[PDB]
Design an enzyme around this catalytic site. Structure first.
Site, PDB file in Angstrom:
ATOM      1  N   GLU A 791       7.848  77.828 -48.165  1.00  0.00           N
ATOM      2  CA  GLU A 791       6.599  78.016 -48.532  1.00  0.00           C
ATOM      3  C   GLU A 791       5.606  76.895 -47.929  1.00  0.00           C
ATOM      4  O   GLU A 791       5.591  76.001 -48.316  1.00  0.00           O
ATOM      5  CB  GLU A 791       6.618  78.108 -49.787  1.00  0.00           C
ATOM      6  N   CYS A 825      -2.340  74.441 -51.848  1.00  0.00           N
ATOM      7  CA  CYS A 825      -2.442  75.472 -50.511  1.00  0.00           C
ATOM      8  C   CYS A 825      -3.196  76.793 -50.744  1.00  0.00           C
ATOM      9  O   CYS A 825      -3.411  77.071 -49.813  1.00  0.00           O
ATOM     10  CB  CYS A 825      -0.787  75.511 -50.517  1.00  0.00           C
TER      11      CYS A 825
HETATM   12  N1  LIG Z   1       2.974  77.995 -49.861  1.00  0.00           N
HETATM   13  C1  LIG Z   1       2.844  77.225 -51.162  1.00  0.00           C
HETATM   14  O1  LIG Z   1       3.134  77.697 -52.078  1.00  0.00           O
HETATM   15  C2  LIG Z   1       2.390  75.628 -51.104  1.00  0.00           C
HETATM   16  C3  LIG Z   1       2.500  74.821 -52.428  1.00  0.00           C
HETATM   17  C4  LIG Z   1       1.866  73.694 -52.337  1.00  0.00           C
HETATM   18  C5  LIG Z   1       1.553  72.803 -50.726  1.00  0.00           C
HETATM   19  N2  LIG Z   1       1.798  73.805 -49.946  1.00  0.00           N
HETATM   20  C6  LIG Z   1       1.928  72.823 -48.589  1.00  0.00           C
HETATM   21  O2  LIG Z   1       2.023  71.712 -48.619  1.00  0.00           O
HETATM   22  C7  LIG Z   1       1.334  70.924 -47.814  1.00  0.00           C
HETATM   23  C8  LIG Z   1       0.746  69.445 -48.476  1.00  0.00           C
HETATM   24  O3  LIG Z   1       1.956  69.066 -49.285  1.00  0.00           O
HETATM   25  P1  LIG Z   1       2.575  67.634 -48.408  1.00  0.00           P
HETATM   26  O4  LIG Z   1       1.623  66.848 -47.852  1.00  0.00           O
HETATM   27  O5  LIG Z   1       3.588  66.960 -49.591  1.00  0.00           O
HETATM   28  O6  LIG Z   1       3.684  68.540 -47.341  1.00  0.00           O
HETATM   29  P2  LIG Z   1       4.505  67.682 -46.136  1.00  0.00           P
HETATM   30  O7  LIG Z   1       4.849  68.761 -45.275  1.00  0.00           O
HETATM   31  O8  LIG Z   1       3.738  66.518 -45.723  1.00  0.00           O
HETATM   32  O9  LIG Z   1       5.821  67.096 -46.940  1.00  0.00           O
HETATM   33  C9  LIG Z   1       6.652  67.908 -48.019  1.00  0.00           C
HETATM   34  C10 LIG Z   1       8.003  67.329 -48.293  1.00  0.00           C
HETATM   35  O10 LIG Z   1       9.004  67.464 -46.951  1.00  0.00           O
HETATM   36  C11 LIG Z   1       9.392  66.104 -46.715  1.00  0.00           C
HETATM   37  N3  LIG Z   1       9.446  65.974 -45.422  1.00  0.00           N
HETATM   38  C12 LIG Z   1       8.465  65.541 -44.422  1.00  0.00           C
HETATM   39  N4  LIG Z   1       9.200  65.292 -43.264  1.00  0.00           N
HETATM   40  C13 LIG Z   1      10.549  66.138 -43.331  1.00  0.00           C
HETATM   41  C14 LIG Z   1      11.503  66.136 -42.577  1.00  0.00           C
HETATM   42  N5  LIG Z   1      11.356  66.030 -41.188  1.00  0.00           N
HETATM   43  N6  LIG Z   1      12.678  66.763 -43.072  1.00  0.00           N
HETATM   44  C15 LIG Z   1      12.567  67.071 -44.403  1.00  0.00           C
HETATM   45  N7  LIG Z   1      11.678  66.936 -45.280  1.00  0.00           N
HETATM   46  C16 LIG Z   1      10.520  66.205 -44.773  1.00  0.00           C
HETATM   47  C17 LIG Z   1       8.322  65.156 -47.392  1.00  0.00           C
HETATM   48  O11 LIG Z   1       9.025  63.924 -47.754  1.00  0.00           O
HETATM   49  C18 LIG Z   1       7.914  66.145 -48.661  1.00  0.00           C
HETATM   50  O12 LIG Z   1       8.872  65.817 -49.987  1.00  0.00           O
HETATM   51  C19 LIG Z   1       0.258  71.610 -47.376  1.00  0.00           C
HETATM   52  O13 LIG Z   1       0.484  71.998 -46.164  1.00  0.00           O
HETATM   53  C20 LIG Z   1       0.319  72.808 -48.349  1.00  0.00           C
HETATM   54  O14 LIG Z   1      -0.418  73.752 -47.807  1.00  0.00           O
HETATM   55  C21 LIG Z   1       2.436  75.070 -49.784  1.00  0.00           C
END
Ligand SMILES: NC(=O)c1ccc[n+]([C@@H]2O[C@H](COP(=O)([O-])OP(=O)(O)OC[C@H]3O[C@@H](n4cnc5c(N)ncnc54)[C@H](O)[C@@H]3O)[C@@H](O)[C@H]2O)c1
Ligand SMILES: *[C]/[C]=[C]/N1=C2[C]=C([C])C([C])=[C]C2=N([C][C]([O])[C]([O])[C]([O])[C]OP([O])(=O)OP([O])(=O)O[C][C]2O[C](N3[C]=NC4=C3N=[C]N=C4[N])[C]([O])[C]2[O])C2=C1C(=O)[N]C(=O)[N]2
Ligand SMILES: [Mg+2]
EC number: 1.5.5.2
Lengths: 1212, 112, 56
Positions: A791, A825
């Site tokens: 998501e 998001c």
């Molecule tokens: N569609 C939804 O419901 C929803 C909800 C909230 C946030 N978001 C999205 O989340 C983003 C912001 O949140 P964020 O900054 O924490 O996102 P992010 O992509 O920077 O990180 C999310 C998680 O992935 C992990 N991560 C980073 N690299 C990884 C890898 N190579 N392999 C596995 N895990 C990895 C991070 O440690 C973190 O726990 C925004 O793009 C927002 O739109 C979507």
């Protein structure tokens, strides 16, 4: 370095005993409020009999003595009457009378009205619908009205237009307002003043959204006071006219959260107006508004009545609302203030104008009870009890009984007794509504009691802004005005004594049977989470201490493996709004321990799967109780760790509670022995909803029977560790829930671990694409893809047309774009303004922008907190400066010097030329604005879809044609009509998007748990009686080709498909929340055999999709002579990357074929694809080899049905 | 009452479109409207916009709005019965144009 | 009954719609089947008449 929460929300002044008794009654149970009111309102049998006779006499006079006659004369339907009045309204916008008459005679009457009249004729049809039909419809069927207008003009011509124009002119110039200007209103007041009436003038307007608009309302009031005072000419405050003001008109941030600004900035303005009213010796009344402004307004009343500069004048007035549970205690406070100050406060007792809004607000906020009564008769008893209190204090206050209810009037008339003098008390009524009643009251020939007419003043444009309130009131079956006209109600029923009716009820003061307390919104399904009232001083004082105490706790997050906490690299966690504020310490997980955790999860998976689903759900429910009880402490952590305001943090914890309880109930509805768990599930969560999304993914995975490796975002490990602690306290075994703090390396090491059986990811699209690539190598022991829920980001738009209400739009835009500094998001990224209204809305929007308070979030007055890291700040700022470098107009709030210790980005508005000016999601407080011509609306929707995202989407319009067009063409998972686009509610707006925004299924929706088990259950309510017609054509084609078994399977898929499911989900009043299942789009089919292809096509067509079939399969000859309807849905693809974006995929093959195809699919540009794979043997054995749950797309739509200004459903 | 194909030309006897066939300019019948806009009509209007066929695109948008395709009403009648009246596409319309603008106008009417 | 309902229905539909710009066609020939010898006979004639057309 300021101590955390040391200045969170100090009250304006220490709360006196009398003030505290008000606050204590705020949400008092209705059964506790009524008995003292019944006693205070009791009168002798002699008085009750005399009052009934007086009431009967007034009502008989009323019944014994405009639009209806017009409708009758020209035989108009209701829609024709409404359309006619909308046309008349438009013609009256032509200033020159001769120009108007020429347009009517030569152009309108002769033919096309459309050719001569950027704004729908029918923008205000909801108001005219109330005038014509007495019923409120929240949106306008503008195509019905257009047809009706054409029909009536072609049938009746110029004469009906002339009559409609003259009718509208009289109503808008003389009936809805006393006058268009204060001078005109004063001129028209002489007639009834000579009969013994008096006046209070209301300069109509909206509540202020900007400083400039508040200053405009100020100068309007000031100029009205001069005109009224000149006309009063020394008649004084009782005989002569006065003014009424609404405090929300005079400051754009009139709220308890901004109390210091209110006392510093609003109070001097009211004082300046009061000084002028004092010099002319006229009344100045403070009108009463929403319940969360009541006690705040008392602080202004207190200071004004104690201000020696206003001494010598008794004209200060104040409204109290008898439908409010605090009313008698407010009166005790005011009467005491009058005694202390020596000012004879004019107290206008009203019943209350915001009833439907108060019910909706308490339900939305999950509060313990309502601040108003829920049975109309209780308000009547409250009114009479409060009148008895006022009539005992006429030496120190001047009671003003505002009512159009002849029974209420008669009861007070006899309660007040025979001694009367002008100045003892008065009645009040609204212009154009109460004159019939009070013509039977005022004057020695009647009851010889005075009445003050509340006189609205304003132009036609200003009047239409909020005329729905009075009209919806007078049309509700509970309203005296409606009942007095209803022939089906007798005078006996109208003179029924509410005091005695309530006294004889079996339970005195019971809540209305048909109104749900906020906790009971979902009935037997589950308990709603509870919020906190940040306007309640008791709540604020208790929260202040709990929040301070939370900042004294030694918060930690450690790698919590099944065997116990593990050692690792330890660092501090700093407050993003002030890096000097150390929130806690995190020990992060080595990659070795992450891989070990997965092995321990795999070893423990049988033991957790054997915990029956009901008992797993019991753990979730226990965790929800724990989080509810711990909410104040959780708020403090979230506020300091994640940059959230108190309001944001309450919503965050409520959402986690709702996830726990929703997935628990969904489990109890579905999961049985055959829905086996996947195995160890890696839950990777974002920083920005650090408790809610974290808890949601883990709870779902656990309750489905999977042990969980929980990898929280590196920015927010502390609240994550606390949520895991709560889940473990609630009974989740340590082996079933392991916490692995750390950065993306820990996430990646978990994803890559051999025993990982499923991945739940919420985060950026770019990171999800890396996880998708890592999983493309992988197969389950059964040789099937590892399920991924991903998501991801949004590029969320809101479309606003010229029928929307600018003040409503601006509030929803400010909230959607800049709440949590845009770090949702769901946040609004692109506002699309119809060209004709763009300048006005943009000016209002920029003005509202500058009223936001940015800073460290441990102060209630802070609206917008920091961005999470310096890196996030740098990324956001780089985008802003790129836009500025292209010459785009950029508006930014100036930041206070105190922000320098944290990482802040000011709320920013960027005016773009084309939506293509944006490339990828900018996760910060940056709103982009584009303008569009109305004829280009469809192309604009294309442009919004063209980004490839599809998360949230908003539309502000009053026009059904526009709703139908836009919502049918937009491709997004969460739609919002006439409201903000954020704060989706679990099980009410199941949340999640499509394209670059998500794979689905939606979190907080009924398909979610089914993805976390090997065999998906049938969700509650999940079915459709509709059969896709292309599927049906394909099944017939199969029978014609001799493929009898596949034709049968195709028909079974057609029946099994839930495409077309269309549900309304239970939620708060004043909103309709819809959940529908649509086609996903174009599904990539990668078959290996002819029968496999037929099964794949049947699955895809039954769920409404088109397909692209892999041409390398060599199966072209299996699909010869398709019906054109099926051919339209079928393409063959040699280059899959050229023929996308796809919305999912179906794959047939052995394990190594599936692995190869999955690698190729993951390499396709754009959206992550939900892939389902099966062997040829599986297709032959299992009719559900491809599960139809994942071939439909969920869409949530939330419509604010109170947007027209009231709730039609609740008026009944 | 009335059918299609070999069963009738329409409009239905005892229905609201009937009288409009018996005058040289048809009125707008009671309740005759729809909030739905044909999506192919919408795509055709945009195509006309891109070509600069401004009068035709305006005619197409106007046809899209005034079309009552998608009308779906319950008619008053006896209890224990639900009596529904709906407007669907006719099917495939034969277009016999003479000019390009005429063809665009015919297409707009048929697609809408 | 059906003949009566045609008469009253086309009367009401006329009162709801027809104005000066809805000109009649002219003489209308109404040809009717035997099997509903009053109802369809009356319906076609009534509609043509109330729309302003003389009827054969
Ligand atoms: N569609 C939804 O419901 C929803 C909800 C909230 C946030 N978001 C999205 O989340 C983003 C912001 O949140 P964020 O900054 O924490 O996102 P992010 O992509 O920077 O990180 C999310 C998680 O992935 C992990 N991560 C980073 N690299 C990884 C890898 N190579 N392999 C596995 N895990 C990895 C991070 O440690 C973190 O726990 C925004 O793009 C927002 O739109 C979507
Ligand atoms: C700006 C503002 C103003 N104000 C006023 C003034 C004056 C002078 C007057 C007269 C008025 C006013 N307002 C309004 C009020 O409140 C009201 O609303 C009215 O008035 C009405 O009342 P009456 O007349 O008394 O009537 P009745 O009918 O008797 O009654 C009604 C009421 O009731 C209630 N409810 C309903 N439903 C229900 C209820 N409750 C409970 N439950 C239920 N279910 C309500 O209240 C109604 O209304 C006003 C004012 C101010 O200031 N403020 C306010 O709030 N208002
Ligand atoms: Mg990141």
């Amino acid at each position: 370095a300021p101590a955390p929460f040391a200045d969170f929300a100090p009250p304006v002044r220490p709360q006196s005993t009398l003030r505290r008794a008000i606050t204590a009654a705020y949400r008092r149970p209705e059964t506790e409020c009524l008995p003292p009111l019944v006693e205070a309102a009791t009168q002798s049998k002699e008085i009750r009999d005399a009052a009934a006779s007086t009431a009967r006499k007034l009502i008989e006079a009323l019944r014994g003595k405009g639009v209806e006659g017009l409708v009758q004369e020209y035989s108009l339907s209701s829609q024709e009457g409404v359309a006619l009045m909308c046309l008349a309204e438009a013609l009256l916008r032509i200033p020159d009378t001769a120009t108007r008459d020429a347009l009517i005679r030569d152009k309108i009457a002769d033919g096309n009205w459309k050719s001569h009249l950027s704004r729908s004729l029918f923008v205000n049809a909801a108001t005219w619908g109330l005038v014509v039909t007495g019923k409120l419809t929240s949106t306008v069927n503008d195509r019905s009205l257009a047809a009706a207008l054409t029909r009536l003009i072609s049938r009746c011509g110029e004469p009906v237009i002339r009559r409609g124009v003259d009718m509208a002119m009289r109503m808008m110039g003389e009936q809805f307002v006393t006058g268009e200007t204060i001078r005109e209103a004063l001129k028209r007041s002489k007639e009834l003043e000579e009969k013994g009436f008096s006046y209070s003038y209301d300069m109509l307007g909206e509540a202020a959204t900007t400083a400039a608009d508040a200053e405009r309302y100020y100068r309007d009031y000031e100029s009205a006071i001069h005109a009224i005072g000149k006309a009063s000419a020394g008649r004084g405050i009782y005989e002569g006219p006065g003014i009424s003001i609404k405090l929300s008109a005079l400051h754009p941030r009139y709220s308890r959260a901004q109390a210091a600004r209110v006392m510093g900035e609003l109070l001097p303005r009211v004082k300046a107006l009061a000084l002028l009213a004092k010099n002319y010796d006229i009344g100045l009344n403070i009108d009463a508004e929403e319940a969360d402004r009541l006690e705040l307004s008392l602080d202004l009343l207190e200071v004004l009545c104690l201000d020696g500069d206003l001494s010598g004048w008794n004209g200060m007035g104040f409204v109290v609302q008898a439908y409010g549970k605090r009313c008698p205690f407010v009166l005790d406070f005011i009467i005491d203030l009058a005694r202390r100050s020596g000012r004879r406060i004019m107290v206008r007792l009203v019943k209350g104008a915001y009833w439907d809004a108060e019910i909706k607000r308490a339900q939305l906020d999950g509060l313990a009870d309502f601040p108003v009564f829920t049975r109309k008769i209780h308000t009547d008893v409250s009114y009479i009890a409060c009148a008895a209190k006022l009539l005992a204090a006429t030496d120190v206050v001047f009671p003003q009984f505002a009512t159009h209810n002849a029974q209420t009037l008669a009861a007070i008339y006899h309660m007040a007794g025979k001694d009367f003098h002008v100045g003892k008390y008065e009645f009040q009524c609204l212009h154009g509504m109460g004159e019939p009643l009070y013509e039977e009251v005022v004057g020695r020939g009647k009851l010889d009691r005075p009445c003050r007419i509340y006189a609205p003043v304003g132009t036609h444009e200003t009047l239409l802004a909020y005329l729905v309130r009075r009209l919806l009131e007078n049309g509700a079956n509970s309203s005296f005005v409606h009942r007095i006209n209803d022939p089906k109600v007798s005078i006996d029923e109208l003179i029924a004594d509410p005091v005695e009716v309530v006294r004889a009820m079996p339970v005195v003061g019971a809540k209305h049977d048909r109104i749900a307390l906020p906790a009971e919104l979902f009935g037997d399904a589950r308990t709603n989470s509870a919020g906190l009232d940040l306007s309640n001083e008791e709540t604020l004082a208790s929260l202040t201490e709990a929040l301070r105490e939370s900042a004294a706790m030694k918060w930690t997050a450690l790698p919590q493996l099944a065997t116990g906490p593990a050692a690792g690299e330890t660092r501090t966690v700093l407050n993003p709004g002030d890096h000097r504020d150390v929130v806690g310490s995190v020990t992060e997980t080595s990659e070795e321990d992450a891989r070990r955790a997965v092995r321990l999860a795999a070893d423990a998976a049988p033991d957790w799967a054997a915990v029956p689903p009901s008992e797993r759900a019991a753990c979730l429910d226990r965790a929800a109780e724990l989080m509810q009880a711990r909410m104040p402490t959780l708020l403090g952590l979230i506020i300091r760790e994640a940059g959230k305001s108190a309001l944001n943090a309450i919503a965050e914890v409520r959402e986690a509670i709702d996830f726990l309880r929703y997935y628990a109930e969904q489990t109890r509805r579905t999961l049985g022995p055959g829905h086996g768990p996947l195995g160890p599930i890696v839950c990777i969560s974002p920083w920005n909803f650090p408790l809610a999304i974290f808890t949601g993914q883990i709870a779902a995975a656990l309750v489905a029977g999977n042990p969980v490796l929980a990898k929280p975002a590196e920015e927010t490990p502390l609240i994550a560790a606390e949520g895991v602690r709560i889940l473990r306290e609630a009974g989740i075994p340590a082996s079933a829930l392991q916490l692995l703090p750390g950065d993306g390396r820990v996430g990646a090491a978990l994803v890559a671990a051999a025993e990982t059986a499923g991945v739940m990811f919420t985060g950026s699209t770019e990171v999800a694409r890396l996880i998708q690539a890592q999983l493309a190598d992988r197969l389950s022991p059964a040789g099937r893809p590892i399920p991924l829920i991903a998501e991801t980001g949004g590029q969320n738009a809101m479309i606003v047309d010229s029928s929307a209400l600018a003040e409503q739009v601006v509030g929803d835009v400010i909230t959607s774009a800049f709440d949590s500094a845009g770090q949702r998001c769901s946040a609004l990224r692109v506002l699309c303004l119809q060209e004709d209204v763009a300048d006005r809305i943009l000016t209002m929007l920029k003005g509202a922008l500058h009223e936001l308070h940015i800073g460290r979030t441990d102060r209630l007055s802070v609206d917008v907190g920091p961005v999470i890291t310096s890196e996030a700040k740098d990324n956001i700022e780089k985008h802003i400066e790129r836009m500025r470098g292209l010459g785009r107009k950029v508006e930014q709030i100036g930041l206070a010097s105190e922000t320098g210790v944290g990482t802040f980005v000011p709320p920013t508005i960027i005016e773009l030329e084309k939506l293509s000016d944006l490339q990828r999601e900018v996760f910060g407080p940056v709103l982009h604005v584009i303008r569009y011509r109305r004829d280009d609306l469809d192309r604009l929707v294309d442009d919004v879809n063209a980004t490839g995202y599809g998360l949230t989407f908003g539309l502000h319009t009053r026009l059904d044609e526009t709703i139908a067009h836009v919502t049918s063409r937009i491709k997004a998972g969460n739609l919002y009509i006439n409201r903000n686009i954020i704060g989706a509610v679990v099980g009410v707006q199941p949340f999640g998007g499509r394209g670059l925004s998500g794979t689905g299924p939606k979190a907080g929706g009924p398909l979610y748990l089914g993805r976390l088990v090997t065999t998906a259950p049938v969700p509650p309510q999940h079915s459709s009686v509709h059969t896709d017609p292309v599927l049906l054509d394909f099944a017939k084609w199969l029978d014609g080709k001799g493929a009898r078994a596949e034709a049968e399977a195709a028909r079974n898929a057609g029946s099994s498909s839930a495409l077309g499911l269309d549900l309304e989900l239970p939620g708060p009043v004043g909103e309709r929340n819809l959940y529908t299942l649509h086609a996903r789009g174009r599904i990539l089919l990668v078959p290996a055999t002819e029968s496999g292809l037929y099964h794949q096509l049947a699955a895809a067509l039954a769920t409404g999709n088109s397909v692209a079939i892999d041409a390398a399969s060599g199966l072209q000859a299996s699909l010869k002579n398709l019906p054109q309807t099926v051919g339209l849905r079928v393409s063959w693809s040699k280059d899959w990357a050229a023929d996308g974006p796809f919305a999912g995929a179906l794959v047939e093959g052995d394990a190594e074929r599936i692995r190869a195809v999955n690698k190729a699919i993951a390499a396709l540009p754009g959206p992550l694809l939900l892939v389902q794979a099966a062997s040829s043997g599986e297709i032959a054995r299992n009719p559900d080899a491809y599960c139809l749950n994942w071939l439909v797309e969920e869409v949530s739509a939330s419509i604010n049905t109170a947007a027209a200004g009231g709730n039609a459903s609740l008026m009944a």
